[PDB]
Write a protein that binds this ligand. Structure first.
Ligand SMILES: [As]
Ligand SMILES: [As]
Lengths: 247, 247
């Protein structure tokens, strides 16, 4: 397997006091294996996370960005993030595709722009309950991935991480580790066939469903799962156990 | 006139070096009159602005927010901002109404939520070129204002500031000071008639068109203009001259 990644998506949560406490716990956690850890705080919390988080396994990520600076009230741009010293970004999260108008094409352009500006990118894909029940899992996740792929040169993939979000199980159903693996394997096969086998081999495909201390090891044992984009448990000391599972 | 406000909307612009330099200039500027100054930086720049800006006439503002914390990847919430010590927010900026799905009703709810959570709010309204040319200026700006008003108790208005954006002149035509005044007067009259004359008298209605050192004094001389929501010139030392114009 390629190097695992265990990424915290804090979403729109946190107080300066809760962050301070959790970051201290993350700093005190000994990690002895090769793993890239990532924390994505809300934009206003990025500076304090950059200042307080020093565990050398970690990088700080934005949870979203737009490509260009300018007359975009309320948005944050990739050049602004680069200047701030942030080199990771999550793009196409289900919540943005669902609530905030991010179509496959919008996400694909954002990913190409982030690549071109020197970011590591956690590009999120996933099908809804309606899509899964209509037997459209393969078409949807491949369509979302293909949109991204069409805007990227082959060498860009060293900077791309995929995150599979089983949106159908998030706040609805239960996703099993076998169901997760099945999607990861389909994605890997497609990349292998259409992009290249070398690229498919090195590509990190992260599971972005419900990840807990109770299932992390079981999930990471699956041959096509390379770590996690963790939601709720990433706001808790439990995130350390999740990291430990990738040993 | 009520107390003037001169607010900087930095939009999606800035580097840590350019901010540092501009904030030093703002700190060195002597302001001897009663004016509320405001700076709204991009979310990631809020901490460094809170740390470096100390001119006592100023407050820091967010450029947007959502009402609640939770599973809203990439957004920033009002409780998060309150915890961070931010007590001002801009809502309904034209760019958000245009690019980011903020309908009159979305903006109105955001304003009520911000009020209920103890924010000072710069609520933005304005008609497009198409609307102005169809003789719909009054209907549009009143509709946008009425939507907000319908969600607010009478005592909330002490925490509301309106900003008129002549979207029809922004990146298109030229708005004259007489055209600006005409809209501000219409807004004030409506508030006086439908909400109350005491409320109308105390209400700050800011001009959010192109504001420069060359037109600020002329604009502020108009009886219904109570200051400015400044775009481009707010990234420049010129912003001091704009403030000086409200003397
Ligand atoms: As440290
Ligand atoms: As100071």
């Amino acid at each position: 397997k390629p190097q695992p990644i265990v990424a915290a998506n804090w979403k729109c949560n946190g107080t300066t006091a809760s962050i301070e406490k959790l970051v201290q716990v993350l700093n005190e956690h000994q990690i002895d294996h090769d793993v890239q850890c990532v924390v994505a705080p809300s934009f206003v919390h990025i500076p304090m996370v950059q200042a307080k988080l020093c565990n050398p396994k970690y990088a700080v990520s934005a949870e979203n960005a737009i490509a260009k600076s300018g007359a975009f009230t309320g948005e944050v741009s990739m050049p602004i993030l680069k200047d701030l010293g942030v080199s990771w970004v999550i793009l196409g999260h289900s919540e943005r595709r669902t609530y905030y108008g991010e179509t496959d094409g919008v996400v694909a352009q954002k990913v190409a722009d982030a690549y071109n500006q020197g970011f590591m990118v956690i590009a999120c894909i996933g099908e809804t309950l309606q899509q899964r029940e209509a037997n459209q899992t393969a078409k949807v996740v491949l369509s979302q991935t293909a949109a991204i792929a069409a805007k990227l040169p082959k060498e860009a993939w060293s900077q791309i991480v995929l995150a599979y979000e089983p949106v159908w199980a998030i706040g609805t159903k239960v996703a099993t580790p076998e169901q997760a693996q099945e999607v990861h394997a389909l994605l890997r096969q497609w990349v292998s066939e259409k992009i290249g086998n070398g690229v498919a081999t090195k590509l990190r495909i992260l599971y972005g469903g419900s990840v807990t201390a109770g299932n992390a090891k079981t999930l990471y044992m699956k041959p096509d799962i390379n770590g996690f984009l963790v939601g709720g448990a990433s706001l808790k000391p439990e995130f350390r156990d999740i990291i430990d599972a990738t040993r």
